[PDB]
From a paper:
NLGNs belong to single transmembrane proteins, and they all consist of a large extracellular, acetylcholinesterase-like domain (CLD) and a carbohydrate-binding region, following the transmembrane region of O-glycosylation helix and the C-terminal intracellular region as postsynaptic density zone (PDZ) recognition component, which mainly binds to postsynaptic target proteins such as Gephyrin and postsynaptic density protein, thus promoting synaptic differentiation and strengthening the stability of synaptic space and the function of transmitting intersynaptic signals. The NLGN structures were highly conserved in both human NLGN2 and human NLGN3 dimer forms as two symmetrical elliptical spheres, and the interface comprises a four-helix bundle including two helices from each protomer.
For NLGN2 protomer, it contains an α/β hydrolase fold, a 13-stranded central curved β-sheet surrounded by 22 α-helices. The extracellular domain of NLGN2 is a cholinesterase-like domain, which might be required for synapse-specific functions. The overall structure of NLGN2 and NLGN3 protomers is very similar, with root-mean-square deviation (RMSD) of 1.518 Å over 522 Cα atoms. However, when chain A from NLGN2 and NLGN3 was superimposed, the orientation of chain B from NLGN3 has a rotation relative to that from NLGN2, indicating the distinct arrangement adopted by different NLGNs. The interacting residues were mapped to the previously identified patches A–C. The results intuitively showed a slight difference in patch B, where F408 of NLGN2 was substituted by Y431 in NLGN3.
Author numbering:
A (entry chain B), B (entry chain A): 42 to 149, 175 to 392, 401 to 552, 563 to 609
Write the structure that this text describes.
Amino acid sequence: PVVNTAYGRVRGVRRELNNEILGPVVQFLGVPYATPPLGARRFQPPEAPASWPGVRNATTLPPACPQNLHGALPAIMLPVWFTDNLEAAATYVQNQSEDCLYLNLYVPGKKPVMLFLHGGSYMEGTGNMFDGSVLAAYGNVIVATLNYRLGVLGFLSTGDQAAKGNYGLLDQIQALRWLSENIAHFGGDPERITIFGSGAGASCVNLLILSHHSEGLFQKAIAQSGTAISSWSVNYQPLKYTRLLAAKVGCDREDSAEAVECLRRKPSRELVDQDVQPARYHIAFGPVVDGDVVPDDPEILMQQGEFLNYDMLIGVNQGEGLKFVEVSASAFDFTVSNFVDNLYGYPEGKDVLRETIKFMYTDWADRDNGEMRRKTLLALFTDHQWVAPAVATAKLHADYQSPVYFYTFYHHCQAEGRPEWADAAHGDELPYVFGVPMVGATDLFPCNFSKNDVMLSAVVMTYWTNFAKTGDPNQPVPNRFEEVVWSKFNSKEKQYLHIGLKPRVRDNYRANKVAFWLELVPHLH
Amino acid sequence: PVVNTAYGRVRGVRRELNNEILGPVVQFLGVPYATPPLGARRFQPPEAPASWPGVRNATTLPPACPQNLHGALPAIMLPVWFTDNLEAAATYVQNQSEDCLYLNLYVPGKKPVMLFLHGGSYMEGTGNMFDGSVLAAYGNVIVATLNYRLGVLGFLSTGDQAAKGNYGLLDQIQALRWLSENIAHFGGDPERITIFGSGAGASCVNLLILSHHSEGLFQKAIAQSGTAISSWSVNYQPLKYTRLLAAKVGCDREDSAEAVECLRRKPSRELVDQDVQPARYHIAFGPVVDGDVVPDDPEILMQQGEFLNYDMLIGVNQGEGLKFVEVSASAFDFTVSNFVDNLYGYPEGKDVLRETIKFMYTDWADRDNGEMRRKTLLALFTDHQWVAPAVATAKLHADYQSPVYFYTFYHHCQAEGRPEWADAAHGDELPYVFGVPMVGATDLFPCNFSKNDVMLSAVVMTYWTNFAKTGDPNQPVPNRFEEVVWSKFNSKEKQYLHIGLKPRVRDNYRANKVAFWLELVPHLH
């Protein structure tokens, strides 16, 4: 397994898969895409790599650039299986170094590419823990789980010229180019790149469409559970926090542009161990508006239809926010005051909105019971963050002559604390799209797989692969049900599809709550 | 059929009923109860009558004191069958005269009395058109349909001393005394008087409980479709209007007390032909707060529990207000602005309430169709007037150790413009309690009676008669269903009973809308 690219010649490996169904998976763990930053051009955009003679021995898990899984990280943005089994995930990124600009591959003539921008809160994660070879061989596609500058030294900007456009986004654009101008040797199609991701890694899958440098690189998108217009998708206070890690290591010279030229020699391990604690439901180090890759906010920029006709696929796990409440008449009256204070932009005229919300999410038919409160509160954080910025992105993107789809996941692998009372909960969609049941349970996903779960993987890896093939999720190839047609989303009818437990194509998901959060509350302020 | 009372000796008559079921009905049309006002003591309280020797020939329809059925009367307060077939009703009160202080009776030892205070808008009506002999003989009770000072010279007050406590209420209290101290000769029980009425004649059935002069007279009540705390139950601007009929006949001397002493000689026929047009949904001549019979408003007076333990029975015809709309996105946006302006007490801070109402009474699942609007508007006038001042009277009267019942009528005799799209509509409960089907259709009620309707009369004249017997509607004696127990109303559960088309004892009528109108909107102002 040896191939050659314009940059040189690289080797590979091949493995035998666990399940009896699947066959010849080839792997190319660790191939590069750009020159690694070293300390001179840190806090700086990337450049192409060098060239080598002979053969490059590249088959290992490459180092993942520095993170810290014991850092009092936010517990809302991160998924469940990442939080609970943290001891298993922590034993997976052990070797870390400033040099992380590599990318894995999985080769099963012009096959589609499925670049996976791993999720998280922009603080940790890696493609090493999302080793999808089952997904690589089932649908007969090429996966690529890269690594990019994430964390402190990942997405810099300050307001001055010393920290220009966010180096992470254009960092993974450097890889979008590499995959676009070197993939013919690997058997891929440079005209069918389909970025996809989850969590807050899908927030930066919309952000790439509205920019400019993305023109000739990719053609489609997939947005699992994220959106560019939520309350933790973009950073809006770079300067206040960028001068607060410098207040514990020391660069806060009152001269504005006197922080890069002392930190740029600071070692990477001390610079990623600061308690930059963001405001509630806000982030600290994410993509920022500067002008070259984020000209104008997606609030405005999305209205003027300068984005081309790609085909976004939005989705929402039904029930997620299980870490918002985990029952009285003054306990349910206590979350719904600090919640409103924390996440409303802080205008004046609040005293009406709290009571309107408190009236709308009550069930007056049976008020008394304690399973209304602590169960509608889980329906008040699922709606304001994941459920109704999504339809706003669906409408305005469907109007401008473009196809936008939808879905709503429901069914999870049953484990501890996961009854039907406990639905997806920001996760439990990832194992199924990754094929964890179909080859036996792995380490980080402990559950009790059955033959009921394994049928879901077939359909959810046929959709997400036929998609990359042609955008419609069904045309090439066809559980408990079958053949249901994948219905679109248009402003008039708003048909979601319910890829849950029995795939019925229902309509108009939560009309009352979506309309309350989207078309009534803007008037109150 | 000749009897004697403490005032003298009176004759009677007896008739044979149309239906084969019923038998010996006796009647005493026209017996007096008080001295008729003549022109000296007009605008003045009543007094006892004289005494006569021999026998008084009293069997005719007595004159009904002056009204005017062609006077551009309000079309919301009045029932339907009274408005449509106005030509039939107008041929029924032909002979009118200042002298109207008489009362009918119907004798079928200490039998209960069922004094009926006829409805309307306090401008017209009479007991002559509600001749209930079927109701008199079926349940074996005594009816009494009196006449009282109604209209212009009926409920006077000005703010000065020239017009003291409302002469109509204490006028029908004079009859409440007469029936309480002369009924032993007629076979009635002076300790079981049960006032009942409908329309805005049931508004002045609550008003008598909260007063004082009602102590030893009656013991129960029935409130069909009315309440003392609605927007047309009491007059709150006597002076502005009492000086406006005097501006077309002439008494508006700028001296305050210079209107009684010129009008008191004016003939009754000119004084009842003035266009005193009230404000929308308000009235002009109704009971007013002065101090002796209405000490304090039922807004306050009902809170302090000075009213004794009677047993009110509230009720609401499901669907009524069919003369509120009789479909666009700016037609439904046009009623819900002037409606809010007209009927809100005119404070500042309106611009939020209109939009909140417009959001709550929409059906976002299917917005487009034209049978949402012009059908939820009929559900916006039924709720703010008849449906949710009623439950407020039920709760606060059930708390103070008293029994309060409830019901919700649904089924009507089918006629023109009366499908199941068109429910009760402020009326169609009166024929059934009056027995119009059971003896064949009368003049003023044209319909097509069937054997389906005639079973409803049995139950609705067993309830309203067992009630007067013992207050519980069921204990002595027991369609499409049977034996369903008459459930009470208490603050915790709010069980209505649905005496409609199939008597199922459901619970918590319109919790969302009742709670919206009763426990959310008071904060917005």
